[PDB]
Write a protein that binds this ligand. Structure first.
Ligand SMILES: [Ca+2]
Ligand SMILES: [Ca+2]
Lengths: 227, 227
């Protein structure tokens, strides 16, 4: 139930109206002491960094309502140096941060408009890890209780890898809500995130998630998929 | 059944006498192109590198009978340069290799001499990942069929980490055979591996596994623990 699959399980919320967008949490990600080779910290690739490791870093923000086009490219002027920047307005966080070096978590639900095969394509500098589906990401309307128990990644991208870019193909049902978790890191210099998809219904590429990303309140009994 | 636990499942081989030692496979691990920053390749920390990634590298050797004291420290004279060296005689591989940069897999079974809590302590430069128990490591006398399906790590050590060194405490039964998998990498400069244990029966530390590490043939029906 926590394993990645081509036919993920979804959720059916009851009367409470879903809220637009995902939630985001932002954390610091320091360089190592001057003189270090390399200048950046490798912690982002400890196997548990995305599960418990990141929690020991400085919390910068927790926001709601993240939607629209969430892609970004941050161009740095040099490596090994923290430099200030801003996220796109879609992230609902107007303050400057060290865009050269930070950790970011997004979670919530994906609602399809069509029933059939979806292919999500991702790329990132330095890292983007994706979980998708009930159990694999977290449990239906029981996120706060299952948040740290996600399974093997459905897709991932690592700058410098043989998987610099990656894809996820899954069969989905329209109007069902699918748990999703995105984990991102920049360890130095440039930063980039691309998250888009296509379906078998037509040849359009979706980059704007305004009609697709939602948040659901947890409930006493949970909201397992009913279809 | 694949999850790490304090009470791992073991195996009960039938009439066929266990063979002394673990099996080992050795693979190449190249530096990046001259001028690269850093000089070493980060692939060793892709989440699937220990599962399928390493298989695309040059196979150097597959040997049997690895036992005794398996600890080593290789001292390099500089970084970013491949340098030749030798493994201890316990590894049954007498040829020189690039000890500055290689990948090594060991697998087989651990047989305890006493019933009770065991604490294994590990450390490594650059990396050592450990799985332990039926399912978590692989299935009883059905290794060849379950070898790539190991679970989350029971313990791991990464040079430069907040877990430079790590421990595994588990309750074991004497004379039972427990599946074990060790995955090691050096990405440059010095190399080191330390694997030892203590038990609740006395204050001795075990560093020599001559009476403890074994290989079992796979069988048609498998050899699940019977106790
Ligand atoms: Ca970067
Ligand atoms: Ca090293």
């Amino acid at each position: 139930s926590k394993d990645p699959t081509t036919f993920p399980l979804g959720c059916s919320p009851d009367i409470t109206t879903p809220k637009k967008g995902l939630s985001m949490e932002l954390y610091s990600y320091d360089f190592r002491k001057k003189g270090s080779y390399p200048c950046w910290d490798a912690a982002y690739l400890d196997p548990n960094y995305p599960r418990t490791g990141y929690k020991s870093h400085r919390l910068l923000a927790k926001v709601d309502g993240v939607t629209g086009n969430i892609n970004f490219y941050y161009h740095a002027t040099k490596g090994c140096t923290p430099q200030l920047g801003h996220l796109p307005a879609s992230y609902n966080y107007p303050k400057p941060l060290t865009m050269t070096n930070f950790t970011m978590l997004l979670y919530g639900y994906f609602r399809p408009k069509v029933t059939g095969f979806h292919t999500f394509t991702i790329s990132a500098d330095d890292l983007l890890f994706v979980n998708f589906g009930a159990g694999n990401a977290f449990d239906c309307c029981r996120r706060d209780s299952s948040a740290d128990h996600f399974g093997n990644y459905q897709a991932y991208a690592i700058w410098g890898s043989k998987t610099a870019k990656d894809e996820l193909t899954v069969h989905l049902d329209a109007g069902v809500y699918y748990p999703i978790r995105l984990f991102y890191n920049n360890i130095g210099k440039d930063g980039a995130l691309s998250f888009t998809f296509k379906t078998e219904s037509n040849e359009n590429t979706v980059s704007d998630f305004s009609e697709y990303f939602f948040s659901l309140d947890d409930t006493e009994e949970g909201c397992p998929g009913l279809i």
